[PDB]
Design a protein around this ligand. Structure first.
Ligand code: 149
Ligand code: MG
Ligand code: MG
Ligand code: MG
Ligand code: NA
Ligand code: NA
Ligand code: NA
Ligand code: NA
Ligand code: NA
Lengths: 1015, 210
């Protein structure tokens, strides 16, 4: 029957004998345990060691397994993904389905996971009441047997499947048999851009309920106009035999104080001609001056639901955390408790580099802490309902949650092929309805989502309306079919740009500013995905936040995304390395496109995270003369854990500093008058830095946490006092092959064949391993390569334009090399043309002036042909002989920063170990740049000017040739790249050119100057 | 003190090279102890008769962004025609140059002055690679205006009919020039991208006879 029915190739059958979905139950038999959320004896975990066997298809599974353990089976930890234990390969594919597109059919070669457990059940559990098993997550489908008898079937990998085992179990030893199919008709609705895995990957538990039971409960909170009064409404449903002596009590607690309570027998109000629900009751509780829930202040009450007899005998209790909050869209704005939200959000997949898609509390808490510490207030459950603990943690720590149905059909052609088909409506409906039934009592969930990338079908419209009707308390959004369909309350585009339109046929991505005011449009706009954080990215991030702040109806967005989906593999010595698509022999695959995070898989931050933190700051600053104006972007809280630190420095040297407590109302302003600053003696630029510090520890941060910062240039005193001229004179030595400059025992060698500084000497010590040459190229970033799929060679991508123009192949042709003696210096003049097959790309004209103080002043003027693609950089490079420990600079830092991603960086004197000047992006590229640098120090060298630089043991050539960071080898000496100019990194998306015009090197003529000397 | 600032000489040296003479200068413009601007220049005169001028200007970050960064002189020549390779033929400024076309233009000198009834800076042409006036040629990438009226006369005079042709021809060659604005005329209306706020400025010019 089981093999005959092939229920996993039938979208009409998504379950057999599965129990109704409901909010989290524990069946407490002690009311205080319910109140305080203590563990319940009636809720047992079946997590731990199970037996597992892998088969190539369900037809390969022996019958004996239903009744007896397989001797060849292994013992494994559950929850797990079986790919993580090495039974088969995890597959990374983005859009293209991992199986042949032939709905509802799946491959006959269908990897099958045979899980089994021998466990004890106590007689007391079977003598009365109901014993159910709960599978929180099984990917992608499964049949269940108990003691050899078939129980049921379940689909949807991301919601719990529950089955009544009361009639199947015996006192003492029992055996479960679970056949998990990797592929099913459900897989057609699970085409998320992530690793494709399978198995029992979330918790398994047993729950005992009395026969007469709480089967469901819904909690609503409604408010008067000023939120000074609320009504808590609790609808409660029972199963079992109705009796007149039955009662429901709902009590509401704040800490240990009961603030409200109501008791009633069952029997709802009249609903229609046939009466009412005899098996339901609604309790209404008045609450004066409720403490309101937000991500700012996550105030929680506790609601306890008791099923009992009239004379006071408890049957059972259930409970939940209640957050008093109202979510509504009014006049085109998303409001929480009457105030317009600004969503500082991120998309977060459930991913662990070791455990795959198994989630644990420690990782969840770590993510939330890092999110809040980096000024995020919101998370999107991309693209499925999460592990149930996630919502509990969001309720308590305070994050706004978009809860999303497990529906994505991206690989369909067209994208709505299934979602417009009424045959797929039952399967889609269960993915929506069972999510709502499970999560509707969590205050952190403020918005429902119908899924992602499934086009726009009639099924979406039906399900949009179902939610609107069943739960009016939360807006519904959905991006498919152009982000502004009739199935969404919120314009929710993915990677729509700030100012630039992308007018795709049918589904255009308008400039977000333009989108709001399209004829007849009135809704708020919140990007469900933006600022694609793939590799060296988040260029232009500040542009989004300026617009978010300027436009009331631009209420923010969710960054794509939180965490790199890299996996751990090991070399022959057992050293772990980060793997991406293809590294497991998985094919076809989409390579590094699984790594889009602000953090590495182990939760180490990418440089881009600090840019996000800074732009998402909750305090805004303006300076006018002596006065700092601080504006609060909090909606609900006063600044009661904040003080403003200010410091004034002259070129990194502290001049004055001080503290002022912040006392700003939500949305308010505070004016801070700085004292008289003593005028500095020496020349240079004064810089003002302010930082907002939290003196007191919180649930989410340590004492001293910095939440906000800003910098201004103050007075500048230009250097006019010409330095006292040294008495020494450099000498020019000319041969046919070289111009050599000598000062004391210092030597500068210029090759006359090549026209470059080929060597420098301090006495007998060599300074260079490679000559100092112009560089116009970078090892391509993921945004430069610009493909979302591995098999696309895209002529429009920046890298392809550079390659085809001959940028990486360009050979230097010497046009001029002369040497002149001056009164106090030697002057070397050079010109070079870079050409590709007859075409001049760039011309570089230089002068090197070596004076008696041993300073080499390099002047560089570059012409760039207007018809060549704008170069990635305009600078110089060389391999230095020296390897030093520290890197010291006056400029923007301390972290990596690029022209379109440097707002978070501060101007000061920074000093880091050399290793910190390299960013270990799993896919290697140009990295570690620091901009607006006036002085750089390394070993015996000092460079002064106004440049961008990076410095590392890896050449641009190695970086562009190597696919994985673990494969990189330190080279002899140190590679230095000093740029007059560097192109933006972009990142609005990573599959089309995304570097904004103002960050492209398009000026045609460029000038920069450097001084190289010994320090 | 932008209109009051006097040039103070910091450096003036001359070196003889293989086929050229190199003059190096440095000036600071100060107002009541405050250094507004620093100009550093080299003039390279070679055997072909060309003078290559390299100009590097520092602008104090806390002084109001300057109206222009350039050079001026009164030429002795009064010639009938002005010939340039650049944007034109009409007056155009950095934030008002979209209508202008790049080409070889040739106009009578009088067309290089715009007779605004209230006199001001006028007649600029941008994106110019070559300018010809009498025996003179200037090459580079610059903005220029050229007329019988000095900037001083224009700012001192209230009505265009009160202007008088001065002895030679005033030439203003700018490396950089501020936007003119106009979103309104009663508050600062020049957009940030057209203000001269970069702090350090570089331009180069070749002056020769044709
Ligand atoms: O539009 C999207 O872009 C991302 C690219 O990495 C990723 O595929 C998301 O799941 C998808 O919603
Ligand atoms: Mg099915
Ligand atoms: Mg997708
Ligand atoms: Mg715990
Ligand atoms: Na806004
Ligand atoms: Na991705
Ligand atoms: Na405070
Ligand atoms: Na690479
Ligand atoms: Na005037």
């Amino acid at each position: 029957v089981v093999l005959q029915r092939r229920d996993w190739e039938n979208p009409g059958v998504t379950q057999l004998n599965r129990l109704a979905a409901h909010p989290p139950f524990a069946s407490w038999r002690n009311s205080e345990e319910a109140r305080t959320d203590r563990p319940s004896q009636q809720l047992r975990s079946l997590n731990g060691e199970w037996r597992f066997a892998w088969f190539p298809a369900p037809e390969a599974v022996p019958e004996s397994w239903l009744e007896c353990d397989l001797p060849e089976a292994d013992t494994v930890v559950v929850p797990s993904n079986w790919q993580m234990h090495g039974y088969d390969a995890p597959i990374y594919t983005n859009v293209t389905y991992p199986i042949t597109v032939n709905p509802p059919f799946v491959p006959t070669e269908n990897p099958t996971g045979c899980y089994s457990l021998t466990f004890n059940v106590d007689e007391s559990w079977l003598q009365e009441g109901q014993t159910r098993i709960i599978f929180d997550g099984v990917n992608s489908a499964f049949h269940l047997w108990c003691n050899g008898r078939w129980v049921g079937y379940g689909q949807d990998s991301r919601l719990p499947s529950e089955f009544d085992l009361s009639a199947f179990l015996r006192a003492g030893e029992n055996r479960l048999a679970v056949m998990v199919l990797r592929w099913s008709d459900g897989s057609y609705l699970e085409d998320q851009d992530m690793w494709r895995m399978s198995g029992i990957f979330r918790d398994v538990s047993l729950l005992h309920k009395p026969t007469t039971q709480i089967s469901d409960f819904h909690v609503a909170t409604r408010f008067n106009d000023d939120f000074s009064r609320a009504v808590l409404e609790a609808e409660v449903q029972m199963c079992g035999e109705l009796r007149d002596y039955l009662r429901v009590t709902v009590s509401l607690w704040q800490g240990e104080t009961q603030v409200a309570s109501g008791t009633a027998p069952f029997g709802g109000e009249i609903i229609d001609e046939r009466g009412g629900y005899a098996d339901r009751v609604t309790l209404r509780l008045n609450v004066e001056n409720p403490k309101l829930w937000s991500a700012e202040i996550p105030n929680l009450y506790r609601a306890v639901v008791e099923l009992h007899t009239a004379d006071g005998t408890l049957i059972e209790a259930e409970a939940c955390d209640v957050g008093f909050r109202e979510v509504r869209i009014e006049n085109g704005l998303l409001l929480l408790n009457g105030k317009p939200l600004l969503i500082r959000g991120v998309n977060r997949h459930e991913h662990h580099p070791l455990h795959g898609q198994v989630m644990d509390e420690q990782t969840m808490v770590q993510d939330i802490l890092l999110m809040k510490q980096n000024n995020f207030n919101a998370v999107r459950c991309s693209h499925y309902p999460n592990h149930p603990l996630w919502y509990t943690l969001c309720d308590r720590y305070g994050l706004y949650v978009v809860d999303e149905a497990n529906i994505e059909t991206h690989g369909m052609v067209p994208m709505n092929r299934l979602t417009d088909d009424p045959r797929w409506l039952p399967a889609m409906s269960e993915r929506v309805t069972r999510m709502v039934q499970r999560d509707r009592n969590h205050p952190s969930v403020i918005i429902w989502s119908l899924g992602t990338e499934s086009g726009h079908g009639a099924n979406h419209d039906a399900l949009y309306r179902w939610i609107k009707s069943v739960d009016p308390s939360r807006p519904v959004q959905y991006e498919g079919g152009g982000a502004d369909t009739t199935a969404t309350d919120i314009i929710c585009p993915m990677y729509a740009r700030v100012d630039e339109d992308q007018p795709f046929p049918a589904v255009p991505k308008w400039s977000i500013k333009k989108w709001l005011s399209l004829p007849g449009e009135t809704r708020p706009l919140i990007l469900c995905e933006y600022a694609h954080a793939m590799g060296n990215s988040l260029g232009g991030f500040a542009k989004y936040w300026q617009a978010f702040r300027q436009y009331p109806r631009l209420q923010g967005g969710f960054v794509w995304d939180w965490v790199d989906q890299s996996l751990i593999k090991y070399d022959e010595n057992g050293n772990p390395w980060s793997a991406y698509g293809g590294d497991f022999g998985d094919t076809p695959n989409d390579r590094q496109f699984c790594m889009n995070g602000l953090v590495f898989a182990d939760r180490t931050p990418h440089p881009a995270l600090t840019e996000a933190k800074h732009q998402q700051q909750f305090f805004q600053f303006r300076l006018s003369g002596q006065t700092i104006e601080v504006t609060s972007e909090y909606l609900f809280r006063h600044s009661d854990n904040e003080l403003l630190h200010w410091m004034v420095a002259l070129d990194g040297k502290p001049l004055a500093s001080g503290e002022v407590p912040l006392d700003v109302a939500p949305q308010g302003k505070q004016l801070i008058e700085l004292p008289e600053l003593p005028q500095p003696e020496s020349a240079g630029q004064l810089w003002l830095t302010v930082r907002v510090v939290q003196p007191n520890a919180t649930a989410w941060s340590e004492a001293g946490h910095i939440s906000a910062w800003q910098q201004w240039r103050l007075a500048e005193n230009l250097s006019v006092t010409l330095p006292a001229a040294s008495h020494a004179i450099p000498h020019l030595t000319t041969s046919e092959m070289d111009f050599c400059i000598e000062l004391g025992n210092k030597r500068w060698q210029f090759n006359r064949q090549s026209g470059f500084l080929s060597q420098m000497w301090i006495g007998d010590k060599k300074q260079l391993l490679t000559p100092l040459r112009d560089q116009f190229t970078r090892a391509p970033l993921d945004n430069d390569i610009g493909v979302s799929e591995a098999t696309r060679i895209d002529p429009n991508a920046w890298v392809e334009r550079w390659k085809a123009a001959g940028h990486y192949q360009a050979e230097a042709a010497l046009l001029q090399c002369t040497a002149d003696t001056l009164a106090d210096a030697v002057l070397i003049t050079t010109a070079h043309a870079w050409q590709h097959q007859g075409k001049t790309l760039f011309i570089s004209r230089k002068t090197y002036r070596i004076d008696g103080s041993g300073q080499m002043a390099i002047t560089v003027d570059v012409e760039v042909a207007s018809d060549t693609p704008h170069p990635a950089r305009i600078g110089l490079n060389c391999q230095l002989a020296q390897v030093a420990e520290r890197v010291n600079w006056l400029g923007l830092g301390p972290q990596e920063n690029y022209p379109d991603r440097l707002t978070a960086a501060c101007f000061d004197r920074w000093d880091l170990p050399l290793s910190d000047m390299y960013t270990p992006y799993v896919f290697p590229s140009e990295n570690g740049l620091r901009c607006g640098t006036r002085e750089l120090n390394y070993g015996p060298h000092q460079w002064r000017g106004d440049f961008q630089f990076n410095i590392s043991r890896y050449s641009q050539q190695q970086l562009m040739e190597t696919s994985h960071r673990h494969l990189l080898h330190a080279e002899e000496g140190t590679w230095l790249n000093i740029d007059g100019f560097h192109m933006g990194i972009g990142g609005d998306d990573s599959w089309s050119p995304s570097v904004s015009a103002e960050f492209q090197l398009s000026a045609g003529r460029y000038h920069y100057q450097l001084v190289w000397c010994q320090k």
